[PDB]
């Protein structure tokens, strides 16, 4: 039957970007015309395909990755980008073929007392490969001498919180992001639109 897009888009709780969620999708009909929820700042850009007549193609599988980032960082979720999120949290392949859909969620993920639940990775020695997920919380060793799980000089916790308050600028307001990746191999196409 229908693909569980509302399961991942209209979902109540989203993930921290370093622990970005992945929802494999197969064996269903995909209606893309409903992904426009008319949220405040709706972003919908695709690579390798046109958003229109998208219910016209079929794919072997479709991956729905979801997370929350800061409003400025939505630019980093794109092929061939460097930065905070692209290097160490979520890396798109240079030949990415799919769509990126993001929207402002200041009304959901911001509390006046400040929301520190969402996290992102600050410290990492090397860039992420595309679609890598690093969930390690080992203390970052920035010095010559080992940390042994203790924060301090030359020894930092690798993650930092986002600090979402409603009155912050739009750049720093929370944004909910779903990246749909279209996989097509020499196998039956299990994800289709109408026709």
């Amino acid at each position, epitope marked *: 039957n229908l693909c569980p897009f509302d399961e991942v888009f209209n979902a109540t709780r989203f993930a921290s970007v370093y622990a970005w969620n992945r929802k494999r999708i197969s064996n269903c009909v995909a209606d893309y015309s409903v992904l426009y929820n008319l949220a405040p700042f709706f972003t919908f850009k695709c690579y390798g395909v046109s958003p229109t007549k998208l219910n016209d193609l079929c794919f072997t599988n479709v991956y729905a990755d979801s997370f929350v980032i800061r409003g*400025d960082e939505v630019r980093q979720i794109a092929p061939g980008q460097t*930065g905070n999120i692209a290097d160490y949290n979520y890396k798109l392949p240079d030949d990415f073929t799919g769509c990126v859909i993001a929207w402002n969620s200041n009304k959901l993920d911001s509390k006046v007392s400040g929301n520190y639940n969402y996290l992102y990775r600050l410290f990492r020695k090397s860039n992420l490969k595309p679609f890598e997920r690093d969930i390690s919380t080992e203390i970052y060793q920035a*010095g010559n001498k080992p940390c042994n799980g203790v924060a301090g000089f030359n020894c930092y916790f690798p993650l930092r919180s986002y600090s979402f308050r409603p009155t912050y600028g739009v750049g720093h307001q929370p944004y909910r992001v779903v990246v749909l990746s279209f996989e097509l191999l020499h196998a039956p196409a299990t994800v289709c639109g109408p026709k």
Partner: antibody
Framework: DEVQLVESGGGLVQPGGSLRLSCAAS????????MSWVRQAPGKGLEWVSV???????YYADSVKGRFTISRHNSKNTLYLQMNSLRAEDTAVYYC?????????WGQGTTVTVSS | DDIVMTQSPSFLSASVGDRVTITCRAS???????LAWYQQKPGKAPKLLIY???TLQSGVPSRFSGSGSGTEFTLTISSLQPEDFATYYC??????????FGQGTKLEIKR
């Protein structure tokens, strides 16, 4: 391992010249840290010039775009700022700094004067 | 446009033993973790006083203290010492450059 940054390479050049500042660190490892170049013009404030991430990515101020290149030699544990097409407004004391919880390790500074 | 930090006052004269507050105002609301306060004396490099707008850097005397959130953050010396007469810059270290500084506040002697 007394932590410090020691800087060198600054000096006097006419406009359009090149100059490669270096910043040798002890106490931490430059390839593993966020390293920043910050300049301060005489009688003025502090201005961020450039930064290199541990993962490799480099960012520059709009003023130095296309003219300055930040880099590092891991074996010598040294940061570098190469300055090309130099201009009089780049005249400043240049510091290197390590940034984890604010910039906590600051170099001495080396002086760049660019004048015809 | 950009994220601009404005320090009030530019110049401020106090006496030894006085309580002093310097205010740093941001153009738009920012996470409090971004702020750092720096102290600089003539001819010497800046020294990190406070980061996260409230967390005290190690080795800094307890009289220094920072506070704030949103667009207004302050740094305070409880009892101003003779060695404290210097210039203080406020800073924001955010997730994507540029890192912006305030214009600095010069702390001079009251006579």
């Amino acid at each position: 391992d007394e932590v410090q940054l020691v800087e060198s390479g600054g000096g006097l050049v006419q406009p359009g010249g090149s100059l490669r500042l270096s910043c040798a660190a002890s106490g931490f490892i430059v390839g593993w840290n966020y390293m920043s170049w910050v300049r301060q013009a005489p009688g003025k404030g502090l201005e961020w010039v450039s930064v290199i991430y541990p993962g490799g990515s480099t960012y520059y101020a709009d003023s130095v775009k296309g003219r300055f290149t930040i880099s590092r030699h891991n074996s010598k544990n040294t940061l570098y700022l190469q300055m090309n097409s130099l201009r009089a407004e780049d005249t400043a004391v240049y510091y290197c700094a390590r940034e984890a919880y604010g910039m906590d390790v600051w170099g001495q500074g080396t002086t760049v004067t660019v004048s015809s | 446009d950009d994220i601009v930090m404005t320090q009030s006052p530019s110049f401020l004269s106090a006496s030894v033993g006085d309580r002093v507050t310097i205010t740093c105002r941001a153009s738009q609301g920012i996470p409090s973790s971004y702020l750092a306060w720096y102290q600089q004396k003539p001819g010497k490099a800046p020294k990190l006083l406070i980061y996260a707008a409230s967390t005290l850097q190690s080795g800094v005397p307890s009289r220094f203290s920072g506070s704030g959130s949103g667009t207004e953050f302050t740094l305070t010396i409880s009892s101003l010492q003779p060695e404290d007469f210097a210039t203080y810059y406020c800073q924001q270290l955010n997730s994507y450059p540029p890192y912006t500084f305030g214009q600095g506040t010069k702390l001079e002697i009251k006579r």
